[PDB]
Amino acid sequence: KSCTVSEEDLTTIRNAIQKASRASLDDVNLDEDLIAKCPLLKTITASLKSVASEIATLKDTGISEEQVDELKQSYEQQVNEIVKSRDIFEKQSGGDVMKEQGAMINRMTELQVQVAQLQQQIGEQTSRMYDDMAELIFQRLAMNSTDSIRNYTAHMMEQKLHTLMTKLETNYRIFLGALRYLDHLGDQPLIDKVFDGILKRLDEMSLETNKERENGKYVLVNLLCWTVNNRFLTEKYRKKQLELFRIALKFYPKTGNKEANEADIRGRQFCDANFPVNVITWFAVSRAA
């Protein structure tokens, strides 16, 4: 494709980016005629919408209202920085009077870069907050260390692990934060028990609604990612290999639908290994036969 933008349409794009930064953070709505002459704008539109959805997802979490407000200000301040960019939106002056960066495709490319970097920046910010939220869950449930779980009976340990799973599973970013928290803590007896608790939840949870299947798929796929390149966790996978095969075929039953299932699995991964796809669509399908 090619991108052409008229002088007045660039002004319209600038205001639409401003409007998506403040208050309700609504979808950037632009005329289709304008989008057609420059399909790059779909990418920019989708990126700002993703950050808005991610911020809204933070609200329906146990995060401090101060924390969410502080993140909303950072997002708005950073979009305002893009809006004030003379390289993107304002007329060339002085030295760059007839530089090539004044052409539309170059202005829009720099807009793509700054919005992509904004998305990465906000992503790193929310990742830290999901780290904190995950840690708070372990602390509130009094299972943040080997010492805290040492004196739990088997029945109590099972009960704590179930409660933990019901809190981690509803938001995969919280689940990822829990794995990062356990990794940094380096408390292996706790990792051992959390692995057992994840498996038990995956083996028994209800799957009646789409929300439950989505929650379970993210947990299953990223539990497998968690074992990659880790001897202790790979050893845990090895011993419970057959149970994970049963779990994989429950979430991904249409074995003959290899291509669609693989695309679904890779879209939920946060490692880059083939291992989750291989377990679910290859190993488990071969063992059942």
Side-chain angles (χ1 to χ4, degrees):
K1 302 155 164 196
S2 86
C3 170
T4 53
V5 185
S6 65
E7 186 183 352
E8 75 274 19
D9 281 356
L10 183 65
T11 299
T12 299
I13 293 164
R14 190 190 206 177
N15 296 333
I17 292 182
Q18 179 89 81
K19 266 123 177 174
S21 74
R22 40 186 66 180
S24 174
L25 323 184
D26 286 328
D27 295 16
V28 166
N29 211 14
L30 293 168
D31 193 310
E32 178 59 54
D33 291 302
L34 204 157
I35 295 296
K37 298 187 295 176
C38 184
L40 286 67
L41 297 162
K42 315 173 92 175
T43 288
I44 296 152
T45 283
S47 294
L48 295 179
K49 183 187 173 186
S50 285
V51 181
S53 301
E54 190 186 343
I55 292 173
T57 294
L58 259 194
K59 286 183 77 79
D60 283 347
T61 309
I63 319 283
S64 352
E65 200 177 25
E66 285 179 349
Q67 283 276 61
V68 171
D69 286 353
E70 162 187 326
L71 180 79
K72 270 187 157 194
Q73 280 182 48
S74 195
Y75 177 56
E76 182 174 0
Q77 175 255 316
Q78 293 183 50
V79 177
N80 286 2
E81 283 298 308
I82 298 180
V83 169
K84 304 208 289 185
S85 174
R86 301 172 301 214
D87 273 6
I88 300 173
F89 291 112
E90 246 137 24
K91 301 284 192 299
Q92 300 172 291
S93 54
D96 356 32
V97 43
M98 286 290 296
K99 279 195 188 182
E100 326 205 359
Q101 63 201 45
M104 263 309 161
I105 187 64
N106 296 334
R107 294 173 178 263
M108 292 302 92
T109 289
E110 174 66 5
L111 178 59
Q112 265 190 239
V113 171
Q114 294 195 22
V115 169
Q117 290 175 319
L118 175 272
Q119 190 171 6
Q120 297 172 330
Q121 162 70 15
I122 299 295
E124 169 66 68
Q125 278 185 237
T126 58
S127 254
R128 300 253 179 262
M129 298 174 63
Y130 279 115
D131 290 342
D132 293 333
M133 189 59 230
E135 176 180 24
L136 272 180
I137 294 172
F138 281 92
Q139 284 166 350
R140 289 166 176 174
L141 295 181
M143 11 164 26
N144 57 327
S145 67
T146 287
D147 289 336
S148 286
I149 65 168
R150 167 177 295 116
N151 286 340
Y152 286 153
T153 71
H155 183 267
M156 179 59 58
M157 183 72 79
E158 193 186 71
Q159 183 175 106
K160 292 276 189 175
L161 284 168
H162 171 64
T163 298
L164 173 75
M165 288 314 302
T166 64
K167 311 299 181 183
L168 302 183
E169 73 186 7
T170 59
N171 187 324
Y172 70 87
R173 315 265 264 94
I174 295 177
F175 183 69
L176 292 186
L179 305 187
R180 292 195 296 273
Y181 165 81
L182 295 172
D183 286 343
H184 179 74
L185 180 55
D187 200 311
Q188 185 163 288
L190 180 57
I191 287 161
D192 175 65
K193 293 300 181 185
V194 167
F195 188 97
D196 297 343
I198 293 167
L199 245 70
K200 187 152 177 58
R201 180 56 175 167
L202 290 177
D203 198 23
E204 296 170 353
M205 65 187 295
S206 176
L207 298 180
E208 288 186 352
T209 74
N210 177 74
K211 186 173 296 182
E212 297 168 323
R213 299 188 292 271
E214 289 297 303
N215 296 343
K217 286 176 177 183
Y218 272 106
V219 171
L220 165 63
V221 169
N222 288 290
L223 165 79
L224 297 173
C225 269
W226 194 26
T227 74
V228 176
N229 228 311
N230 185 269
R231 293 202 190 186
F232 179 79
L233 282 172
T234 292
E235 176 64 18
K236 293 286 292 187
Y237 162 80
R238 227 211 66 250
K239 302 208 225 81
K240 287 308 181 177
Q241 196 174 9
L242 299 174
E243 183 176 354
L244 279 165
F245 291 169
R246 296 196 301 266
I247 292 169
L249 297 187
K250 179 175 56 182
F251 288 95
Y252 297 92
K254 296 180 174 182
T255 65
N257 228 341
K258 196 110 127 185
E259 186 180 356
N261 291 336
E262 165 161 8
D264 178 286
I265 293 162
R266 291 196 194 279
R268 314 174 184 272
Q269 284 178 36
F270 291 89
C271 69
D272 84 320
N274 286 343
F275 180 75
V277 162
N278 294 337
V279 167
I280 298 168
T281 72
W282 180 18
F283 301 160
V285 178
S286 291
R287 182 82 54 159

